[PDB]
Amino acid sequence: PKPFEVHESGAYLHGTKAELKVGDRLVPGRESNFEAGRIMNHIYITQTLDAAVWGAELAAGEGRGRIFIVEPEGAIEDDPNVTDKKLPGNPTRSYRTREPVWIVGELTDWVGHPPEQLAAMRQGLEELRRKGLAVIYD
Numbered sequence: 126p127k128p129f130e131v132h133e134s135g136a137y138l139h140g141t142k143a144e145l146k147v148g149d150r151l152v153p154g155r156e157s158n159f160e161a162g163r164i165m166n167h168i169y170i171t172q173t174l175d176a177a178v179w180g181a182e183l184a185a186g187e188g189r190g191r192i193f194i195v196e197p198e199g200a201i202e203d204d205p206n207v208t209d210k211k212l213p214g215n216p217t218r219s220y221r222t223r224e225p226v227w228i229v230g231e232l233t234d235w236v237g238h239p240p241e242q243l244a245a246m247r248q249g250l251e252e253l254r255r256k257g258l259a260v261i262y263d
């Protein structure tokens with residue numbers, strides 16, 4: 126995938142290693158993928174495939190990444206972890222919602238980041254943790 130490229134569909138995507146199926150309704154309050162033990166207030170979704178693939182790859186869990194197309198029941202807002210942080214605005218088109226979402230499809234035709242790019246991201250995040258700089262906004 127290409128960073129900042131909006132998916133053809135305009136649809137909201139959710140990358141995860143959870144075993145979801147079309148027709149599931151997902152409510153907030155599951156555990157963070159980035160800070161063990163943290164109970165989440167939001168569901169995180171995106172309109173770029175690149176951000177969804179990172180969500181699938183970086184999600185906690187055994188088993189492979191999945192990307193779902195989802196329909197929010199309620200309001201969505203910019204995800205502050207990636208908005209006005211490294212870049213101005215929200216170029217990854219990443220959002221979050223306090224209300225449930227429905228799983229309406231599964232994206233089957235994606236490929237992951239090349240392995241050294243995924244390893245660099247993983248290593249970078251462990252480093253931020255080791256330095257106490259991995260602040261999670263939620």
Ligand SMILES: CO[C@H]1/C=C/O[C@@]2(C)Oc3c(C)c(O)c4c(O)c(c(/C=N/N5CCN(C)CC5)c(O)c4c3C2=O)NC(=O)/C(C)=C\C=C\[C@H](C)[C@H](O)[C@@H](C)[C@@H](O)[C@@H](C)[C@H](OC(C)=O)[C@@H]1C
Pocket residue numbers: 128159176179180181183206207208210211212216217219245246247248249250253258259260261
């Ligand atoms: C869609 O976002 C993805 C890719 C964007 O593509 C791309 C090109 O545009 C980015 C934007 C616009 C950012 O604002 C950004 C950012 O703020 C950030 C890191 C992190 N960089 N490092 C980690 C590895 N590394 C390169 C060295 C340091 C980034 O790489 C990016 C970044 C990119 O890479 N944040 C930090 O540095 C700091 C200080 C803290 C991070 C804290 C928590 C832990 C994270 O926020 C968690 C909650 C997730 O939100 C991220 C892991 C995102 O994963 C998902 C699934 O969302 C990932 C950024």
